[PDB]
Amino acid sequence: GTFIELVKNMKGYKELLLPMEMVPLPAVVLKHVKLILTSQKEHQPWMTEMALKADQCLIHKATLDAKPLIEAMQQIILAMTRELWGQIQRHHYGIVQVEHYVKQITLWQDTPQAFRGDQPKPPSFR
Amino acid sequence: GTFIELVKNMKGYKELLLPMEMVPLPAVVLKHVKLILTSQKEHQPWMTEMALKADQCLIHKATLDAKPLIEAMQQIILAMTRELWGQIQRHHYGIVQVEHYVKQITLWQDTPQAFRGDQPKPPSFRS
Amino acid sequence: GTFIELVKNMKGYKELLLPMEMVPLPAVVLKHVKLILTSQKEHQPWMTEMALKADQCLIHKATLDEAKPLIEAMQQIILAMTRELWGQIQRHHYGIVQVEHYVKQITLWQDTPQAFRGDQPKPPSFR
Amino acid sequence: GTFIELVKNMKGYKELLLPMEMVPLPAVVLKHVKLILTSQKEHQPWMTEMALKADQCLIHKATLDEAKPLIEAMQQIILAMTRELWGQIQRHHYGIVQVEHYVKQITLWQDTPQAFRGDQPKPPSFR
Amino acid sequence: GTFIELVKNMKGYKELLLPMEMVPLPAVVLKHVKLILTSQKEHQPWMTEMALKADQCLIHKATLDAKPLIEAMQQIILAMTRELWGQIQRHHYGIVQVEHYVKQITLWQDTPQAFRGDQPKPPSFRS
Amino acid sequence: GTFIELVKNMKGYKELLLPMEMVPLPAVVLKHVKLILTSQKEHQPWMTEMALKADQCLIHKATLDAKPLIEAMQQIILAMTRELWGQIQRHHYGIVQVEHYVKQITLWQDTPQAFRGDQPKPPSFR
């Protein structure tokens, strides 16, 4: 995964992916995909990326129907699901709000529990 | 493939992926990713998207190092390269030029081989 | 800390050391050093000193990762550096006045008996 | 020095490290720390960081004053700190531009063969 | 090759050297050097650089007139011609045009042979 | 080496290479290459020439690990080192200053020792 490491060291880079624990489960994340694609018109390039991304999860899920080999796919599904959910948040809240929101989550989850305070408020559907 | 099928059944859709017979090998495609990512400044959102797909492809290749599982994964890798390779040409030529170039190949490929003629050349690089 | 004693009498002096229990583990502290450096667009002399200070911790981690007195001595140096590094991160993220003002409230809040503490003080907003 | 690599590409960056042979022994370096602090009348944030940095050396001196790898490791940390402390002393006494400008002349002067070096470069005036 | 590797890992880098499979033979390349150098006026700094490389290549060829030594030198000569030949095209076509022409060959060469198509032509000569 | 002779007979040509004796030793000359390339940004065409030139010396140096054949490489290393050092001087002092400085060196080194006087002052880092 050296490719992402190079980007993470670049100038003006802000992470847009939530921690694995905070990411929803599969399937339920896919439900939001239909609520966006089916409810959208005037196709745009980003809509194809999500479709070409969501369908990969289904193929991996269908593969459930070597165990170390199988374990790799399960991690991949979570990785793709984490990436896929980021676009869903990017679509609802835009891009700027997600940048600030993700930054606060890290601080609240990094400081010791004795001084965290309260979980930061997620952004609004503006 | 239902999700991609829905997108194709839309208005304003423009396919940007070349036929599988023209995409380079996975190793070659990853080579261009490093050159583009390494020689870039002022990180842009699309750069992260390209990197994430490259990371996913690497994991599958490492996993290769159960026949339905093995055979199915190979198809995913080929699809991943096609999606990633088509995104590279957007950076080199441009999305507008890619549409015509992909469209030209389709008519050229669909035309009978007897009178097919010379293959059209790729567009000019983005300035 | 004889040098520190030479700074207490100075007019504009402040105690730039958060409680030892407040700071997280060294690994997490270094993680936020990259984010502040990566996010920053321009350059100031302070970040260069910050970058060098963090680098020393990694060598100490690698170096640490009859000898008990020295092995224990290395840990104390690493922890002390983390507090100083963690102080800069907090002050930059929130502000010098807010951190010092916040520290006094929480420091007194813990001292007050639990039967009358009430609620914990206001955590500074990221601004 | 991965963090340092993140600062080289920055526009306003300079190499703030004099040659190891140029700096004196640690004891002499700490001696001039008091003079700059004692002479100074007002307070700025930089001296507070300088005071803390010097204090760490004294603990290392006391701490240093199968164990060979760690004992040798402590010496390297002390020497590296002295260069950074010695750099600040020189820049403050003479100036940032003069020190960097002077370093290049002397660095090249030594490289030139003795048969054609001539005379040593100009030592910066105390101003 | 560390030094060249460092340059490739920079921003604004543009490779100007063709693949070794396309460079002419060393004798042919030296032929163009004489024509350019002989038919020139108002000596320019780049002219000296081209001449010096040509002189170095000649010495190696004369030296040919120990297998690791002999084999290693032949690789140097081929590299020398590639570096020298790439510099000739800068004078004929131009640096800007060379970048695209070299870039076009890379995509053309990387594209699968089945659908590779006609080889792109060189740019127009500098006026 | 007839190629350089043709250039040396051209109009408006000024030598920028110091005598062999005044040129530093190898390796130490290479140290300045790193201090320039590693400290440089916004790659420029000349930076590639130095890299493609310095690396040749390393290959020749590695060859140390037929003696008339070997002697040829040693002379080549000095020749390349002399050429490589000229670029280093050209980078620090520019081009105009080096032209004048090299000219004075020749006069001081050509006149008899009874009338040389003092070695000319090398230029400054302007």
Numbering used by the authors:
A (entry chain 1B), F (entry chain UB): 0, 2 to 65, 75 to 135
B (entry chain 1A), E (entry chain UA): 0, 2 to 65, 75 to 136
C (entry chain 1C), D (entry chain tC): 0, 2 to 65, 74 to 135
Show sentences the authors wrote.
We used cryo-EM density maps of the pH 7.5 and 5.5 samples to build atomic-resolution structures of ACNDV capsids. At the N-terminus, the ACNDV Cp sequence starts with a small α-helix (α+), which points towards the capsid exterior surface. However, the very first residues are not visible in the cryo-EM density map. The α2-helix is wrapped around the spike helices of the partner molecule in the dimer and the spikes are made up of a four-helix bundle within the dimer helices α3 and α4 in each monomer. Comparison of the AB dimer, formed by the quasi-equivalent conformation of chains A and B, with the CC dimer, reveals that the four-helix bundles forming the spikes match well when superimposing AB with CC dimers, while the hand regions appear to be shifted. This rigid body like conformational shift between the quasi-equivalent capsid subunits observed in the cryo-EM structure agrees with the solid-state NMR measurements, which show few local conformational changes, as is further elucidated below. Secondary structure elements derived by NMR and obtained from the cryo-EM structure of ACNDV Cp at pH 7.5 agree well. Residues 66-74 were omitted in the structure because the cryo-EM map density was not well resolved at the tip of the spike for pH 7.5 and 5.5 capsids, yet the connection between the spike helices was visible in local resolution filtered maps. Unassigned cryo-EM map density located below the spikes of AB dimers but not below CC dimers was found in the ACNDV capsid maps. Likely sources of the diffuse density below AB dimers are enclosed nucleotides and/or the flexible CTD of the capsid protein.
